[PDB]
Symmetry: D2
């Protein structure tokens, strides 16, 4: 049925540390840069909200592509709360990342904007060399986040 809209803060359980500054201080960005690609994500096994497992959810975010289809579309990606996550700044904690799989791919070109990702939501570990995630989603719909200034 209709997806339950989520916020990124609903993916952090009660008592767990909040999401850090999306733009780390200079000394920290340099320390994580000097450290290996392993050390990039400082909370790769962050606590997860187990009551979210199996629901139909809807979450906004930016797309970090992981796989391209035969058709030239992104079919596997990380959903993150901010643009540049894993690329321009360190990865977010693993409870601020969703590993998404979609049959209806997204155009590689239009990934500068945020999107709404709707689908079956799972509390299952997912790893990539780029980042670890505590959540997974089999998307039904990937639609641009609409906002007019």
């Amino acid at each position: 049925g209709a997806p339950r809209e989520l916020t990124w803060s609903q993916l952090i359980p009660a008592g767990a540390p909040p999401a850090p500054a999306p733009l780390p201080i200079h000394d920290l960005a340099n320390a994580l840069s000097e450290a290996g690609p392993a050390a990039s994500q400082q909370s790769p096994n962050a606590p997860v909200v187990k009551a979210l497992d199996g629901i139909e959810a809807k979450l906004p975010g930016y797309i970090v592509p992981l796989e391209i289809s035969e058709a030239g579309l992104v079919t596997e990606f990380l959903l993150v709360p901010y643009y540049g996550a894993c690329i321009h700044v360190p990865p977010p904690p693993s409870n601020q990342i969703v590993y998404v799989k979609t049959a209806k791919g997204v155009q590689m070109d239009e990934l500068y904007q945020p999107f709404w990702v709707e689908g079956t939501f799972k509390v299952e570990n997912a790893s990539s060399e780029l980042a670890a995630a505590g959540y997974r989603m089999q998307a039904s719909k990937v639609t641009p986040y609409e906002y007019e200034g």
Copy 2:
């Protein structure tokens, strides 16, 4: 001399409301979209940290261009803590925006990445049709935010 590095949280005075979710909930983004371009920025006159006035500061962020030079470089812009601010999502509160003027312009092309903005920091109101800011900066240096995954 050497600039004092700032965080975006140091631009919010003690007792003032914290910065909201950079990705508003669907009903809120639609409410601000339906409302005029005036209503886009919900805190246009947010409290400011007056002890910051006149210092040499350094702050990281994303560039929202406002003016292009004869040379095809951005010489006036808003420094914001997240990509897409004012364009893809509503503007941040006015105490989470710096109106920057630079003699050494930035290339329009390379604005997909975050930057370090160093210069003389002022606690002075600055308005644009896009957003109001509680801070101003006359930048000495605009350099890309360096981070290796």
Copy 3:
């Protein structure tokens, strides 16, 4: 009335040199890089088709922004036949550039795609530090170039 659709080749008069390779050979790109910003455009006063003066025209191309409005939109720009012209590769000849002025601005974000520029077409010189143009246009409509793969 209805605009006359133009091709970039219709902007080059009979007998005039054709447009060069949009991706110059390595030694040439280095020679123009080593040479001043003046030398970037090798044909800044290329012959123009005078029979085009005063018509209602429609031409496809990429936007090189020159001026930003109060609203954060591009209101003055160069229309070029290829992406990156003047920025990533040398400027095209001046008879392969249109200096466009528009009241209905274009979003700075969506300049990765080509557009259709319709409006009053003039055979008048226009200079910028970035490049010289032999044509001008007061655009009525700036609409994205539609194509589905």
Copy 4:
């Protein structure tokens, strides 16, 4: 050894049709849009220069990603002479496309700029759902096209 620099025109044999307008006329772009994804590339089996087979070559161009690595880098792509090829405009003829495989991947972010692709050059057919190519390359080096305005 040192790669032989190529131009895109050296990939078209003597007597073969030249590369068409990179920005098709409106009626043509609509005709190819209305037609299936098969019909997008109008010359999918364009004549090739067989004397190029086995050489160490260097060619400039734009990257159309086809495959992403575990590390989040593009390791398989189409090298095309213009930005937007296959995405914003129809694919170029198959003798104006190189199917490239690289061990040293390219960052997904920095694909807005042209590159120099050096490596072993083969005259071998390569197909994708996006476009057919008459040339292949096992790249040794993928470096940004350097040019200063």
